[PDB]
């Protein structure tokens, strides 16, 4: 049982929940690989059994009546069919657990408040689009964002999978050049040239919302144009830097991850988009200032008349703070839900305290919980953390092409 | 099967083959990663010794030579006759540099080859220890043009207690427990402050009172030594445009000299071997001054800046911290005392990683310690996957001698 210390307060806890760690991680006694982004059949019944036990534990209902009853049914279902179906309440329970188990998510204080749309009877990419359109409408909610997941049919042998080829439901185009440089978002150059390959008339803008490439089983993807009124965006302005608006920056309201695989009780859902609301550093620090993303830092510094000729002026740090200010200001003025990294980390510390008493610990990935600016100014920096894998879970998966 | 490592800013991919040589074991398992935790027999002495001797003879292009096997035999024979062995002077220099080179938590390692090694393994007493330490401070400080150095005191050996420096650094500010339970001065130094008083030091009552040294010779109580004031170079903190900042009365010292770590070379242990370089500005401006459990000045500065401190979304904390770090950089430059900002230091560390990939096939690095505590993703090391592991020679933590 690893001892874990908080260095701001001096308090000590023990992560006994780590003792239940499932699939192995990438680290060994000889070397730590914790900073890497991607870590390098009656088994279905062992995973389903454990998940069923998880479910009845939470509702205080282990070891009586409906517990064993549900245990025999999954056995019989897998015996007769090779797989099984989750009850709607279990699907709801599994989706919230997978979020609760996500070591890289700093917003898990919200994990109990999640709206689950059950799309396991979807039949075509046409239907997907209507589902995705329903999700976006619900989650966006005129700017009062609501956490939501839409769960499409599970993987089954013999047939292809449902897949959303985009990494997010809302992404901006990345247009290559005669000279290699990119207009738009460099992170989406690949899917941009895919969408263009499947017939999408490209734009000429820095912030063109890409179409969706949606894949029903055993069929090639189909392009769908997202209804422009369904995509809520926020023009970025600064509260006092009048010229900031003239930079023409914008970002969208809804962060909806559409390329991760949801795994519950041994079942796999390769199409299960989930959405919450943004922490402001995600937009203002990573999306806008990463060198391989929009890389706007020096343009803002020039406008601020900062001395970009010496690193020790801290011009980078100054421009970054004002970009993050512009993001928070713009989203608040638009009445679109957003949370700053100070508020989010303080709530995560509360979440850790809750999870200590509820489960004996919390899987947390320090490198991803600590925000990309002002790290040691937040309480999570001074909190030791233990990282490990539990099921239900959101897993990474290969791109479908 | 060597770890593949990606840089996400550029797209580069390398393989850390050096990691396959990790001489000891860390805290992680395939079950769980503990990377974020702060604190993670003749035959076995011989095999450590043999490995270090192999390293040294490789470095001087004498691998497998007459002199190489001769040294191996000399060490085998001394361990059999005495239980231990003595390093040659050139082996100690090589081993101290390698220990720095191998330190996973040091972002300053582009400098590792430029290290001045003072051999004090002949030191006899705590009074001689104090004289060696004073000369280290004088050489390293160099009137503000700082020079990296280490002074190596006698090794742990059978029959005798250890040399120990009780202070965690050679220069440290007292922390006076008080009665709100509050601390005046540096809260990190409350324990050592109380030990100094208990050992005859007449305390002060300021926030920046330089501590005396508590020096321990083999099998003796520690002995208290005051640092000659003209050896301790300090920098008053001012801000280039916020003129009220000087009235805070803040100061920091020029020389970061870690004095409580253990230096291990070929199985030999040097419990006393203080080493010093020069500061990265975030160490002072962000950690020492802004940590809630250190001087904790952030809110006071933000109030003086007229920032709105009743809402987090004003980013008042971020804005005050940036100006504190500016103050440190400006003040050390004004004083002509070496200091490196977090952008230049992380840029130089990336070149070190590239140098090391060609030289050794990798580089042990602790991502959480390498990425600066402010502006993390604005520096190139944020975007660089790293592999953490333990090579020897090495600097190691050791328990406090009390
Ligand atoms: C509601 C407010 C939420 C906030 C403030 C939030 C915040 C964050 C942040 C900042 C990250 C870091 C990822 C990055 O840097 O790109 C993250 C990761 C993650 N979040 Fe959340 N999130 C929220 C909702 C959700 C929901 C509703 C789910 C799932 C049901 C979820 C699942 C995840 C997962 C799986 C990751 C890991 C991403 C990856 O490894 O690629 N989050 N979250
Ligand atoms: C010359 C310029 C140097 C710079 C800019 C530098 C920078 C740093 C920084 C920023 C840290 C993080 C520690 C903290 O946050 O408190 C560190 C750690 C460390 N440095 Fe360096 N350093 C330098 C010289 C040296 C030298 C000369 C040595 C040894 C000969 C050394 C060995 C170490 C070790 C062992 C650690 C780990 C300390 C610990 O974990 O307690 N450094 N360094
Ligand atoms: C629901 C949600 C709310 C929120 N507030 N934030 C996120 C963040 C997810 C995310 C994860 C990653 C990691 C890799 C991505 N996949 C394609 C490999 C990103 F890079 C990224 F930009 C990104 F937004 C999700
Ligand atoms: C030569 C050198 C140059 C430089 N630029 N920086 C350092 C910083 C070392 C350091 C390490 C730690 C880790 C904890 C171990 N200690 C408690 C025994 C500190 F806490 C600390 F304050 C501290 F300065 C050293
Ligand atoms: C190389 C490094 O692991 C990589 O840049 C990680 C670091 N921490 C992160 N943390 C978050 N939240 N998101 C990220 O994309 C990353 N990237
Ligand atoms: C708990 C956490 O590991 C701790 O605060 C670490 C994180 N990274 C650090 N990095 C550096 N350079 N110095 C530190 O003291 C720490 N502290
Ligand atoms: Cl994003
Ligand atoms: Cl320090
Ligand atoms: Gd102007
Ligand atoms: Gd002024
Ligand atoms: Zn690890």
UniProtKB/TrEMBL annotation, chain A:
Its EC number is 1.14.13.39. The keyword Nucleotide-binding does not apply. It comes from the Eukaryota. This is Nitric oxide synthase 3. One of its GO terms (molecular function) is FMN binding. Belongs to the NOS family. One of its GO terms (biological process) is nitric oxide biosynthetic process. Signal peptide: none annotated. Its cofactor is (6R)-L-erythro-5,6,7,8-tetrahydrobiopterin; FMN; FAD; heme b. It is an enzyme of class 1 (oxidoreductase). It is found in: Membrane, Caveola. Keywords: Calmodulin-binding, FAD, Flavoprotein, FMN, Heme, Iron, Metal-binding, NADP, Oxidoreductase. The chain holds residues 68 to 480 of 596 of the full protein. Homodimer. Interacts with NOSIP and NOSTRIN. Interacts with HSP90AB1. Forms a complex with ASL, ASS1 and SLC7A1; the complex regulates cell-autonomous L-arginine synthesis and citrulline recycling while channeling extracellular L-arginine to nitric oxide synthesis pathway. It catalyses: 2 L-arginine + 3 NADPH + 4 O2 + H(+) = 2 L-citrulline + 2 nitric oxide + 3 NADP(+) + 4 H2O. One of its GO terms (cellular component) is caveola. The keyword Acyltransferase does not apply. Its main location: membrane.
């Amino acid at each position: 049982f690893p001892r874990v210390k908080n260095w701001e307060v001096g308090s000590i806890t023990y992560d006994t929940l780590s003792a239940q760690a499932q699939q192995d991680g990438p680290c060994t006694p000889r070397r730590c690989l914790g900073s890497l982004v991607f870590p390098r059949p009656e088994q279905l019944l062992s995973q389903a059994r454990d998940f069923i036990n998880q479910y009845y534990s939470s509702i205080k209902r282990s070891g009586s009546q409906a517990h064993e009853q549900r245990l025999q049914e999954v056995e019989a279902e897998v015996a007769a069919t090779g797989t099984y179906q989750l009850r709607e309440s279990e699907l709801v329970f599994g989706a919230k657990q997978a979020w609760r188990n996500a070591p890289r998510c700093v917003g898990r204080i919200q994990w109990g408040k999640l709206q689950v749309f059950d799309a396991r009877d979807c039949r075509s990419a046409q239907e997907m689009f209507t589902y995705i359109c329903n999700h976006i409408k619900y989650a966006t909610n005129r700017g009062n964002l609501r956490s939501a997941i839409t769960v499409f049919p599970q993987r089954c042998p013999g047939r292809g999978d449902f897949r959303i080829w985009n990494s997010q439901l809302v992404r901006y185009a990345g247009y290559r050049q005669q000279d290699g440089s990119v207009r738009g978002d460099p992170a989406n150059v690949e899917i941009t040239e895919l969408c263009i390959q499947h017939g999408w008339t490209p734009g000429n803008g820095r912030f063109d919302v890409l179409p969706l490439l949606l894949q029903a089983p055993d069929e090639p993807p189909e392009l769908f144009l997202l209804p422009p009124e369904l995509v809520l965006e926020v023009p970025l302005e600064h509260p006092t830097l009048e010229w900031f608006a003239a930079l023409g920056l914008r970002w969208y309201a809804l962060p909806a991850v559409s390329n991760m695989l949801l795994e519950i009780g041994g079942l796999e859902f390769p199409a299960a988009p989930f959405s919450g609301w943004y922490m402001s550093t995600e937009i203002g620090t990573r999306n806008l200032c990463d060198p391989h993303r929009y890389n706007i830092l020096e343009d803002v510094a020039v406008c601020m008349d900062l001395d970009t000729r010496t690193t020790s002026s801290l011009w980078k740090d100054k421009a970054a703070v004002e970009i993050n200010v512009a993001v928070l200001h713009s989203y608040q003025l638009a009445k679109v839900t957003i949370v700053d990294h100070h508020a989010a980390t303080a709530s995560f510390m509360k979440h850790l305290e809750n999870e200590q008493k509820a489960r004996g610990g919390c899987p947390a990935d320090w490198a991803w919980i600590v925000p990309p600016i002002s790290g040691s100014l937040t309480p999570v920096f001074h909190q030791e953390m233990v990282n490990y894998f539990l099921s239900p879970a959101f897993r990474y998966q290969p791109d479908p092409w």
